[PDB]
Amino acid sequence: FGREDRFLNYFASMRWFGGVPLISLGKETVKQPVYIVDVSKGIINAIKDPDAKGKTFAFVGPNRYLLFDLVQYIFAVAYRPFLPYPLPHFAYRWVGRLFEVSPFEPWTTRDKVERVHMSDMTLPHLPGLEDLGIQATPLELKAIEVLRRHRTYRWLTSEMEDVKPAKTVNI
Amino acid sequence: TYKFVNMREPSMDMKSVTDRAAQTLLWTELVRGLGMTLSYLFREPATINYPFEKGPLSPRFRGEHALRRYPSGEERCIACKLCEAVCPAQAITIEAEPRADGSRRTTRYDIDMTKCIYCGFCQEACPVDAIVEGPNFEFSTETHEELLYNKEKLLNNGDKWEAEIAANIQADYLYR
Amino acid sequence: SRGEYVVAKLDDLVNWARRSSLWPMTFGLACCAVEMMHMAAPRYDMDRFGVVFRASPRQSDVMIVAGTLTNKMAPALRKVYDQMPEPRYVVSMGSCANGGGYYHYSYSVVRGCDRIVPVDIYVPGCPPTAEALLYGILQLQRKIKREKRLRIWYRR
Amino acid sequence: HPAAHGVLRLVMELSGEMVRKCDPHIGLLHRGTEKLIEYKTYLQALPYFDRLDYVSMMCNEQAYSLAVEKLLNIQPPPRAQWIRVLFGEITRLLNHIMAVTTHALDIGAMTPFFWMFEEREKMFEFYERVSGARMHAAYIRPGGVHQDLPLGLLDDIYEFSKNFSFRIDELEEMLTNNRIWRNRTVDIGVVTAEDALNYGFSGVMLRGSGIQWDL
Amino acid sequence: MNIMLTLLTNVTLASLLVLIAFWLPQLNAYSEKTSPYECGFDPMGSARLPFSMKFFLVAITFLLFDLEIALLLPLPWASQTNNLKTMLTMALFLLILLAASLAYEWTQKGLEWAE
Amino acid sequence: MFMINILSLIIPILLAVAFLTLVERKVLGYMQLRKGPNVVGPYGLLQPIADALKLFTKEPLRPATSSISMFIIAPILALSLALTMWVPLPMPYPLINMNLGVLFMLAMSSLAVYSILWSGWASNSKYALIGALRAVAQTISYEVTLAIILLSVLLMNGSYTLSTLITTQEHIWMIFTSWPLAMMWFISTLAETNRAPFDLTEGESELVSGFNVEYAAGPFAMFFMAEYANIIMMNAFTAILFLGASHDPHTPELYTINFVLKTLALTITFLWIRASYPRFRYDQLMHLLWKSFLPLTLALCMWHISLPIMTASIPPQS
Amino acid sequence: MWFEILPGIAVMAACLFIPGMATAHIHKFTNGGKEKRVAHFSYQWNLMERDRRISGVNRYHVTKGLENID
Amino acid sequence: ELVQVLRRGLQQVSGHGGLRGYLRVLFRANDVRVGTLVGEDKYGNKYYEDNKQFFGRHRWVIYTTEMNGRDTFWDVDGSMVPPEWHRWLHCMTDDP
Ligand SMILES: CCCCCCCCCCCCCCCCC[C@@H](O)O[C@H](CO[C@H](O)CCCCCCCCCCCCCCC)COP(=O)(O)OCC[N+](C)(C)C
Ligand SMILES: CCCCCCCCCCCCCCCCC[C@@H](O)O[C@H](CO[C@H](O)CCCCCCCCCCCCCCC)COP(=O)(O)OCC[N+](C)(C)C
Ligand SMILES: CCCCCCCC/C=C\CCCCCCCC(=O)O[C@H](COC(=O)CCCCCCC/C=C/CCCCCCCC)COP(=O)(O)OCCN
Ligand SMILES: COC1=C(OC)C(=O)C(CC=C(C)C)=C(C)C1=O
Ligand SMILES: COC1=C(OC)C(=O)C(CC=C(C)C)=C(C)C1=O
Numbered sequence A: 001f002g003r004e005d006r007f008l009n010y011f012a013s014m015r016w017f018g019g020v021p022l023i024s025l026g027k028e029t030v031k032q033p034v035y036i037v038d039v040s041k042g043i044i045n046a047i048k049d050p051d052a053k054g055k056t057f058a059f060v061g062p063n064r065y066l067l068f069d070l071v072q073y074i075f076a077v078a079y080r081p082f083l084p085y086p087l088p089h090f091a092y093r094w095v096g097r098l099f100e101v102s103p104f105e106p107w108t109t110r111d112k113v114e115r116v117h118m119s120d121m122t123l124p125h126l127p128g129l130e131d132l133g134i135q136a137t138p139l140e141l142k143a144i145e146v147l148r149r150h151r152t153y154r155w156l157t158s159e160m161e162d163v164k165p166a167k168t169v170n171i
Numbered sequence B: 001t002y003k004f005v006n007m008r009e010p011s012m013d014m015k016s017v018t019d020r021a022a023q024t025l026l027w028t029e030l031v032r033g034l035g036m037t038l039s040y041l042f043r044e045p046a047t048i049n050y051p052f053e054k055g056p057l058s059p060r061f062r063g064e065h066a067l068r069r070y071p072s073g074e075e076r077c078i079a080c081k082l083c084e085a086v087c088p089a090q091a092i093t094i095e096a097e098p099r100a101d102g103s104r105r106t107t108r109y110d111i112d113m114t115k116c117i118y119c120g121f122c123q124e125a126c127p128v129d130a131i132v133e134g135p136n137f138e139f140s141t142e143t144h145e146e147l148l149y150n151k152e153k154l155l156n157n158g159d160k161w162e163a164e165i166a167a168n169i170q171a172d173y174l175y176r
Numbered sequence C: 001s002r003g004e005y006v007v008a009k010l011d012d013l014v015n016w017a018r019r020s021s022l023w024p025m026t027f028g029l030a031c032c033a034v035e036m037m038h039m040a041a042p043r044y045d046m047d048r049f050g051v052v053f054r055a056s057p058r059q060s061d062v063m064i065v066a067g068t069l070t071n072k073m074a075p076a077l078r079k080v081y082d083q084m085p086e087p088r089y090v091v092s093m094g095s096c097a098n099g100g101g102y103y104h105y106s107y108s109v110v111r112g113c114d115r116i117v118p119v120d121i122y123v124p125g126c127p128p129t130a131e132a133l134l135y136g137i138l139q140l141q142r143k144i145k146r147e148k149r150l151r152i153w154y155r156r
Numbered sequence D: 001h002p003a004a005h006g007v008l009r010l011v012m013e014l015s016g017e018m019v020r021k022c023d024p025h026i027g028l029l030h031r032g033t034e035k036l037i038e039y040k041t042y043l044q045a046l047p048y049f050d051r052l053d054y055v056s057m058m059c060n061e062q063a064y065s066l067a068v069e070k071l072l073n074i075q076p077p078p079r080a081q082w083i084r085v086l087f088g089e090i091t092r093l094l095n096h097i098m099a100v101t102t103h104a105l106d107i108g109a110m111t112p113f114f115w116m117f118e119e120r121e122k123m124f125e126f127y128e129r130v131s132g133a134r135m136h137a138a139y140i141r142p143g144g145v146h147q148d149l150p151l152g153l154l155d156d157i158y159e160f161s162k163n164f165s166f167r168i169d170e171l172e173e174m175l176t177n178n179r180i181w182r183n184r185t186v187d188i189g190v191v192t193a194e195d196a197l198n199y200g201f202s203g204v205m206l207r208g209s210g211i212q213w214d215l
Numbered sequence E: 001m002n003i004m005l006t007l008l009t010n011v012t013l014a015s016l017l018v019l020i021a022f023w024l025p026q027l028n029a030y031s032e033k034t035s036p037y038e039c040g041f042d043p044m045g046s047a048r049l050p051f052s053m054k055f056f057l058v059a060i061t062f063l064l065f066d067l068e069i070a071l072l073l074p075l076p077w078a079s080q081t082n083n084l085k086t087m088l089t090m091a092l093f094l095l096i097l098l099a100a101s102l103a104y105e106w107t108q109k110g111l112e113w114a115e
Numbered sequence F: 001m002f003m004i005n006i007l008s009l010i011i012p013i014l015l016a017v018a019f020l021t022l023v024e025r026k027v028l029g030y031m032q033l034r035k036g037p038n039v040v041g042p043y044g045l046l047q048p049i050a051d052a053l054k055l056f057t058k059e060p061l062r063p064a065t066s067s068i069s070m071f072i073i074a075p076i077l078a079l080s081l082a083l084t085m086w087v088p089l090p091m092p093y094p095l096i097n098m099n100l101g102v103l104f105m106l107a108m109s110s111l112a113v114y115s116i117l118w119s120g121w122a123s124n125s126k127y128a129l130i131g132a133l134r135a136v137a138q139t140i141s142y143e144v145t146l147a148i149i150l151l152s153v154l155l156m157n158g159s160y161t162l163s164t165l166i167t168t169q170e171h172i173w174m175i176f177t178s179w180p181l182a183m184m185w186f187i188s189t190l191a192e193t194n195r196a197p198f199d200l201t202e203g204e205s206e207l208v209s210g211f212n213v214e215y216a217a218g219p220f221a222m223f224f225m226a227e228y229a230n231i232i233m234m235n236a237f238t239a240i241l242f243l244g245a246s247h248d249p250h251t252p253e254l255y256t257i258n259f260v261l262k263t264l265a266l267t268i269t270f271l272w273i274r275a276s277y278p279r280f281r282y283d284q285l286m287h288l289l290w291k292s293f294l295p296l297t298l299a300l301c302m303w304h305i306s307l308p309i310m311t312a313s314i315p316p317q318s
Numbered sequence G: 001m002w003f004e005i006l007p008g009i010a011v012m013a014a015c016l017f018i019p020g021m022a023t024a025h026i027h028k029f030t031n032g033g034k035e036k037r038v039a040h041f042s043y044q045w046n047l048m049e050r051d052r053r054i055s056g057v058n059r060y061h062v063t064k065g066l067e068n069i070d
Numbered sequence H: 001e002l003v004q005v006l007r008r009g010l011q012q013v014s015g016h017g018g019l020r021g022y023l024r025v026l027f028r029a030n031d032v033r034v035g036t037l038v039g040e041d042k043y044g045n046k047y048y049e050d051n052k053q054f055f056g057r058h059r060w061v062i063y064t065t066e067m068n069g070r071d072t073f074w075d076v077d078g079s080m081v082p083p084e085w086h087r088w089l090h091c092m093t094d095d096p
């Protein structure tokens, strides 16, 4: 997730349709997003690390969220009215197939819908950011730098410590 | 000795007062300005047809830098480093050593054309007319690195522009 | 192929439209702006090429950095470059903008405007003559003539 | 800003459009010229004065050369002094053309700028023919001038001079008696002679208040 | 009916021009691009703060003088009455009263802007 | 068939505006000892096409602080009103024949100010707000005097129908009867259209771009086209009002050619005036319109009410 | 240039020619070729309505002369 | 005297080798003036002078349509002038 990402911007742009369609209301999906600067610093460190020759790393964020909680927090940081409604899997797939027809960059695809609803894997046997000397930045410290663009003029100056960070399903 | 620019007093007779009233109510001076613009409309414009027509220049024009040779083909530069010393912008970098035949010649001669102020001091300082500012001025590039000249580029510029540089020097060396 | 021909023709049309109407921002810094004015003067008449000054950044296509860029001004120059709608182009004109020039080693001078904004054309001189800047603008037009946006989009 | 005349941050406190306070912020073109001069020799520091006031350049060269000559206890030859004064008057013509035309352009008169910049271009040609640079000549130096005049320069200067007065007359016909110009200029920015003296003013900014002073 | 169709056609053309301008080209909007323009530096305050009006009294006088336009407009038809004496006398009375109100506003420094 | 008429009205007007941009640029250039657009197309004949194509392929911006609805509405209203103000013009036959055409032009022209007002307010920037306030001041300056001048001139036409003006000046131009009213009307139309010396709402040297400083690409081009169409339309209105061409019912093309030549002369005079003078202060415009134009306009309105009654020259069509 | 300003002026003049001529020809085409009738007042409208009723083809511009009164 | 300038324009049309050459020189150089040929390059550039024109317009060059490898029918630039004709064309000298 970052300024030019397709993760936070993707959910923030769903306000144009009026509601947020989520499969199973997003209560059966768990996400662990990671900050862009952390990934880039990890790449540079892996270049500069001689022990990372044949290794395989897994870059994950510090907190795990339910999809419903994550999207609710996203809409709260952007100060937009949150209208979540459940959409069945086949209907969402049909919507994605319809959007796939764009000759330009599609707004969404069936594969994108599949990947959004799929929970992040837990791979504790792989090295992570911490093994390269990186402390992963939580979403609650960098969400405003992405979602402040999506606010209206009335809420443009609101500070980051106003939107009450969300609940994490951790352990 | 001084003069006044705004120290006149208008007449107060009926004739001049009526002329001023006519000027106020019928806009005489505005019509005169319109007439001046109309006169300018019908003159020939001063525009020239660049790039097919060029602006006038002189043999003293200071354009792109170049390194010159003697008629035998030997380089004129003998690495005295006076151009480097005199350069107000520290745009010239020089390294030299004895050549294989024992000549005093440079191994590195660079001019940073993004540091250069094009003052012509280097060609004044040169005692053998080795470094000159040529007549070329149309050498804009697309990258910054293309404006960092080394010895090969300057020698190529000299070989390219010698036919004009020699004639320009012949017409002006008696003033120097 | 038909589509290749159509995208080539459309790219040619859009390139001609963009390079035949270039509007530089009313923006100058130092001595080189005087030569910019002389390029706007009757002798060279940049407006006869379709080149028109406009004050607002939102109504500008080209930005000509004509003068020394200092550290106090770099935020404002970057701000007005960012507020230009795309496509946009930058012309670095003169030694000061190209690499610092006479003030390269100063404590308050940015050593080239390309440390702040990307540059398309570098016009050398201190100052470059009005004809030199005109040559730079025509070179920028020739560079715009060579863009392949729709062909590359089709090739994706 | 088109009327900022370069790099100026005027922070203005306004009630409506009435100007309650002006705060000029400068230094957006501070290049640290004096320190750099401290790091150069006397001939190397000459081109900086070309770039101090880039509208009147040979005048700055003349001032710097006069200071260095005073410190050197030497005297330029008479021909050098005559050439210096001639090109100083040409430079004054250039500066006054630029100032008046850009003042009118800021107020709203766009055309005299275009009329007079052709004469400015011809004077630039004189500059180039005498030095090889159109505006940054470095011609005037603490010994005199760098080079002698080319064999056909005085005739061309005379040809320009015998005609410049008609251009001045056309500019005056455009501006001097216009009622809109007078409305925009008369009784605007009035400064008293005592205030002008105490505030450090010089040149026209003194002479416009009746102070009879000219260096 | 014809006027309604003309208005609809003009509005549709303008709206289609806007829609073409907004959906045809490539958009790249970020925070710095969409910020307010204040000549390169951030503004100090808000543009929604009160902006004092120095010609308010002239604005109210304009409100009052606009209705005399509605009073004077039917004059081309009023010129066709049989009693031209009364019509001319009352029209001149209205115009004289308007000029008198203008003179009263002028002499009491009403047309001068506040400082 | 009426839709074909609407298109045949509005498309040539847009083309004329597009080429008026080029003509203005070339006229100003030649008045400034230069040439003007001469390169793209022979004699710059393809410059307007390039300008339009470049403007409509550029990114439009929506400011972060802007009120989006009014921001988008304002250019639509501007161009719609600019196109609409053409339908009652008799050339020599109007698209829409109205009993009160002059009142229609008055009402729609006074409605067109809200485009500038709402664009400046919705931009939510200081320079745009200053431009909008200047527009308010300008409208207050010119509206009443313009209305009284129109009434005074039409007291000799006998009605508010625009076609009757062709019959009124069948033998003599109306300018030989009301040339002072014509002078004040010309100045008032310069002030109405925000043209030099009365272009305060933009004020390039003072307010960067003024009310439209936040607009870019197509929305900005819309304001530009509305402005130039207003210029052409107001000069055509002045030509119909004060320089009446003779109309032959069996050959209206002669009248069309005559009227087009006269309105082109007036538009070129507009460009001339722009090229010849400096700009006013917007309080000085108010003082000019209220302390010089208004008393003379009132006196001349009294004069033109009295004169037909004294001279027994009252026009028909009560 | 000064005569190179003339092609653009000619193009603008040609563009401005089209509205009036087009309106005249469209009026002529849809009114039997005789200059579309004007109804500023109710009397002229009543005249047109009577013309429409007596035309026999529901078209006002179809004119019946002295051959319609036997 | 209007007939005189119209006849001059017709002769300008005829002096470029017909309508085709006239239109070629109009669309390539945006200029239809006729001058005295001074010389030609080994690359194809042609040089013309006309001393009745004011200073700046009295000398010009019609560029070649094909330089070393590129087609210069439309894309011409001032750097295609060789140094000797560069000296002549910029009025640094009087001798071609
Ligand atoms: C219908 C409304 C919507 C669309 C509006 C379209 C408006 C009409 C299009 C206008 C076409 C004219 C443009 C072409 C003029 C170029 C002239 C020529 O010179 O161009 C040359 C070559 O031109 C280009 O290579 C190609 C230009 C056109 C490409 C194909 C035309 C496509 C038109 C299709 C229209 C359909 C629009 C889409 C509708 C939805 C390159 O020369 P140039 O560098 O300049 O000049 C050098 C300067 N010199 C002469 C002084 C030395
Ligand atoms: C001037 C007066 C005359 C003009 C009259 C013509 C008016 C034309 C209409 C005005 C719009 C013209 C713009 C043309 C560009 C198309 C823009 C958009 O509509 O296309 C995409 C629309 O596609 C969407 O992405 C989704 C595709 C399908 C949407 C589902 C709706 C249901 C339609 C059913 C489709 C099934 C097949 C259809 C055929 C039966 C959106 O992509 P987007 O990136 O955002 O926008 C940027 C466009 N870029 C890339 C060119 C810069
Ligand atoms: C038997 C008697 C019957 C009736 C007789 C009537 C005859 C009366 C004769 C006098 C009437 C003349 C009308 C003139 C109206 C205004 C004149 C005027 O004085 O206004 C000026 C100002 O007016 C202007 O100067 C105009 C300003 C804007 C000028 C813009 C460019 C000028 C346009 C060029 C010429 C336009 C040609 C107009 C007609 C065009 C064809 C329609 C006042 O300003 P100040 O000098 O500051 O004086 C007041 C302070 N004490
Ligand atoms: C007439 O159009 C022009 C301007 O707009 C008024 C300018 O600002 C400028 C720049 C000069 C001012 C003082 C910023 C030039 C050169 C110009 O030609
Ligand atoms: C000579 O004084 C100066 C100006 O006034 C004429 C300027 O406008 C500007 C910049 C504005 C235009 C676009 C050149 C500069 C840099 C300047 O130095």
Ligand code: SF4
Residues within 6 Å of the ligand: B083, B086, B087, B088, B089, B090, B091, B092, B111, B115, B116, B117, B118, B119, B120, B121, B122, B123
């Ligand atoms: S011209 Fe001046 S600044 Fe340039 S290299 Fe020579 S001495 Fe250095």
Ligand code: SF4
Residues within 6 Å of the ligand: B076, B077, B078, B079, B080, B081, B082, B083, B084, B094, B122, B125, B126, B127, B128, B129, B130, B131
């Ligand atoms: S002054 Fe001349 S000879 Fe000496 S190093 Fe420089 S180029 Fe060579």
Ligand code: SF4
Residues within 6 Å of the ligand: C030, C031, C032, C066, C067, C068, C093, C094, C095, C096, C097, C101, C102, C125, C126, C127, C128, D051, D054
């Ligand atoms: S490059 Fe030279 S002329 Fe240009 S701003 Fe810098 S010092 Fe002045």
